[PDB]
Design an enzyme around this catalytic site. Structure first.
Site, short mmCIF file in Angstrom:
data_model
loop_
_atom_site.label_atom_id
_atom_site.label_comp_id
_atom_site.label_asym_id
_atom_site.label_seq_id
_atom_site.Cartn_x
_atom_site.Cartn_y
_atom_site.Cartn_z
N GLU A 146 1.77 -5.95 6.38
CA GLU A 146 3.22 -5.75 6.22
C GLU A 146 3.86 -6.99 5.53
OE1 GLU A 146 4.41 -2.78 7.04
OE2 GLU A 146 2.29 -2.21 7.64
N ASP A 198 0.80 -1.25 0.00
CA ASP A 198 0.00 0.00 0.00
C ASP A 198 0.83 1.30 0.00
OD1 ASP A 198 0.91 0.13 2.62
OD2 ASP A 198 -1.10 -0.36 3.52
N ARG A 233 1.19 6.67 0.12
CA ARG A 233 0.38 5.71 0.85
C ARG A 233 -1.02 5.75 0.27
NH1 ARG A 233 -2.62 2.57 3.28
NH2 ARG A 233 -2.28 1.77 5.41
N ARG A 285 4.22 11.14 3.74
CA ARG A 285 3.77 10.34 2.60
C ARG A 285 2.60 11.08 2.00
NH1 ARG A 285 2.96 4.53 5.42
NH2 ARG A 285 1.34 5.84 6.39
N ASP A 323 -5.70 -1.00 3.78
CA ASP A 323 -4.58 -1.52 4.57
C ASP A 323 -4.18 -2.90 4.07
OD1 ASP A 323 -2.62 -1.14 6.70
OD2 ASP A 323 -3.84 -2.31 8.04
N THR A 324 -2.94 -3.01 3.59
CA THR A 324 -2.34 -4.27 3.25
C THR A 324 -1.58 -4.78 4.47
OG1 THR A 324 -0.44 -3.08 2.14
CG2 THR A 324 -2.16 -3.97 0.69
C1 LIG Z 1 -3.85 5.59 5.17
C2 LIG Z 1 -3.47 6.64 6.14
C3 LIG Z 1 -2.57 6.36 7.14
N1 LIG Z 1 -2.23 7.31 8.04
C4 LIG Z 1 -1.31 7.08 9.17
C5 LIG Z 1 -2.21 6.53 10.32
C6 LIG Z 1 -1.32 5.46 10.95
O1 LIG Z 1 -0.60 6.07 12.09
P1 LIG Z 1 0.34 5.18 13.07
O2 LIG Z 1 1.63 4.92 12.29
O3 LIG Z 1 0.46 6.16 14.18
O4 LIG Z 1 -0.20 3.80 13.35
C7 LIG Z 1 -0.39 5.02 9.84
C8 LIG Z 1 -0.77 3.70 9.15
O5 LIG Z 1 0.00 3.60 7.97
P2 LIG Z 1 0.63 2.18 7.61
O6 LIG Z 1 -0.52 1.18 7.50
O7 LIG Z 1 1.45 2.35 6.34
O8 LIG Z 1 1.57 1.93 8.76
O9 LIG Z 1 -0.39 6.01 8.87
C9 LIG Z 1 -2.82 8.55 7.99
O10 LIG Z 1 -2.50 9.38 8.88
N2 LIG Z 1 -3.71 8.85 7.04
C10 LIG Z 1 -4.08 7.97 6.12
O11 LIG Z 1 -4.93 8.32 5.28
CA LIG Z 2 0.06 -1.54 5.87
#
Ligand SMILES: Cc1cn([C@H]2C[C@H](OP(=O)(O)O)[C@@H](COP(=O)(O)O)O2)c(=O)[nH]c1=O
Ligand SMILES: [Ca+2]
Length: 129
Positions: free
Chosen positions: A37, A15, A29, A75, A34-35
């Protein structure tokens, strides 16, 4: 919402992908999904799926929603299209991602993605198996 051009720099995982957008490298991103890891079940398949889709495309596009375009880690947050097909949606249709991270003001394609997820779940595909 409107599509904008970009070019693949490098696939990263299910993702996240590195693209050149307005002439600058950026990690993207995918919105609303959500994919797993890479180290988790279906993570390698998700990374492969996205990698294949982005690498085979002749045309990559970026589609921002109405809210924030960058997350807290720098991102970009977009819907990404590979020859007119939304990668975010394709992942969910395959049961390689779930609908997730649905924040108000960046949720334009939520119900489209939910519909794909319901069809993936019915088929008990990958994550739903
Ligand atoms: C998809 C997305 C993720 N995120 C942030 C929330 C999550 O915070 P935390 O890292 O504090 O858990 C994290 C999840 O991304 P990943 O799934 O790539 O880790 O990225 C956003 O802030 N906005 C979004 O639209
Ligand atoms: Ca992910």
């Amino acid at each position: 919402l409107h599509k904008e051009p970009a070019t693949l720099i490098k696939a990263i995982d299910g993702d996240t992908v590195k693209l050149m957008y307005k002439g600058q490298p950026m990690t993207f991103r995918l919105l609303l999904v959500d994919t797993p890891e890479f180290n988790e079940k279906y993570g390698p398949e998700a990374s492969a799926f996205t990698k294949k889709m982005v690498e085979n495309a002749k045309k990559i596009e970026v589609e921002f929603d109405k809210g924030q375009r960058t997350d807290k880690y720098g991102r970009g947050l977009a819907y990404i299209y590979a020859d007119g097909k939304m990668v975010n949606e394709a992942l969910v249709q395959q049961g390689l991602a779930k609908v997730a991270y649905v924040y108000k003001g960046n949720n334009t394609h939520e119900q489209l993605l939910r519909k794909a997820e319901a069809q993936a779940k019915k088929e008990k595909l990958n994550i739903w198996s």
